[PDB]
Amino acid sequence: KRPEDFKFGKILGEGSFSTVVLARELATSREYAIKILEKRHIIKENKVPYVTRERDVMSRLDHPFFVKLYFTFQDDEKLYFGLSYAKNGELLKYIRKIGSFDETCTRFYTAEIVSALEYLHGKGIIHRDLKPENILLNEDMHIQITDFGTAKVLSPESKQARANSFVGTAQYVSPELLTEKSACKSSDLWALGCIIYQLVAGLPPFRAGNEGLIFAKIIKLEYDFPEKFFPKARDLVEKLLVLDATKRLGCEEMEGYGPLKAHPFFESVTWENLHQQTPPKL
């Protein structure tokens, strides 16, 4: 494909070295979110690892709750990644707007994230930057998870469990990354715990005016629940926000996703056809 194969529209996101722009493919009339990277910039900033990594990770993804990579092309100066377009924006936008999700909405969107992570972890991949800003909503209001630049493919051949790069967003970073200096699949489950808490409480659990203060609270597991927090959701959060990464519900050591999906908070959930169910109105 060539850039001339598309008509570009509004900018969907501006990054430090890349931009995402809405595009319509002329020959088919389909809409894509195209991620564009300046080739000169990548070499200068040594962002190539982030770029090559992202292509290979996304090439492995084929699940309804993840952004799909449809095509990639290049011209003398730029790299283009054709991605799924999610019309309804970030999950964060809705948390801020509504303030906090009711129990039905909390359960439904938490279940979709759990289903997504079960797939991703099954493929041996750690997102490492899960947060509401990276959980988009498509036209039907189902989730689409994006931003795989920070993602890691763990090697099957050495039964790899740990990733060493320090990446992520402070409010959602796991204690093991801060103290042991490495992350694992279970690090995404810590982030899930923060996200569930945020859907109900309106803000993430560890929050402060700067990163260092946040890190200090994470390491000490210093947070509180607001009054009226749904009880079964509270129990689930307490089973995810655990300092020991081998003791989080859903992690390999705790025998995987089955026990997590079996949590009482999810009792009314039908897991199989989640992506075809009608989302509860927010």
Ligand SMILES: c1ccc(Cn2cc(-c3c[nH]c4ncccc34)nn2)cc1
């Ligand atoms: C540069 C790097 C990363 C980002 C964040 N981002 C948004 C998206 C995205 C994929 N499909 C979409 N559809 C609508 C809006 C945003 C997106 N992927 N990554 C924005 C700019």
